[PDB]
Amino acid sequence: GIRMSLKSDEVFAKIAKRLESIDPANRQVEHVYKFRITQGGKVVKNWVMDLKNVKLVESDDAAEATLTMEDDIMFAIGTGALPAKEAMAQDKMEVDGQVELIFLLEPFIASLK
């Protein structure tokens, strides 16, 4: 447990698993998103989910939409307990870039196992 553990790491492992089952013949969301996870206000980890090339990696690259939120918030949204729009209304999540692209991911949350 020497490497910082975050509840949200679990969600990212599930997202990478979900990527394994994409239907190449019927793509639905082809955008690049970045998630900046904070803890105690500081930035602890960055992930880039590239849906154009189909990859999810811990990296600090640029993206079409960037979502910044605390680890607990990412966990809550990713497990389907907190709706994204409510997180935004309560100031628990910040988004830069082409904001509307994030809404395209909502109907896929339920597919995470």
Ligand SMILES: CCCCCCCCCCCCCCCC(=O)O
């Ligand atoms: C609004 C915040 C969403 C955060 C959690 C995202 C979880 C959804 C991840 C789903 C990726 C699967 C996408 C399939 C795309 C496709 O077939 O083209």
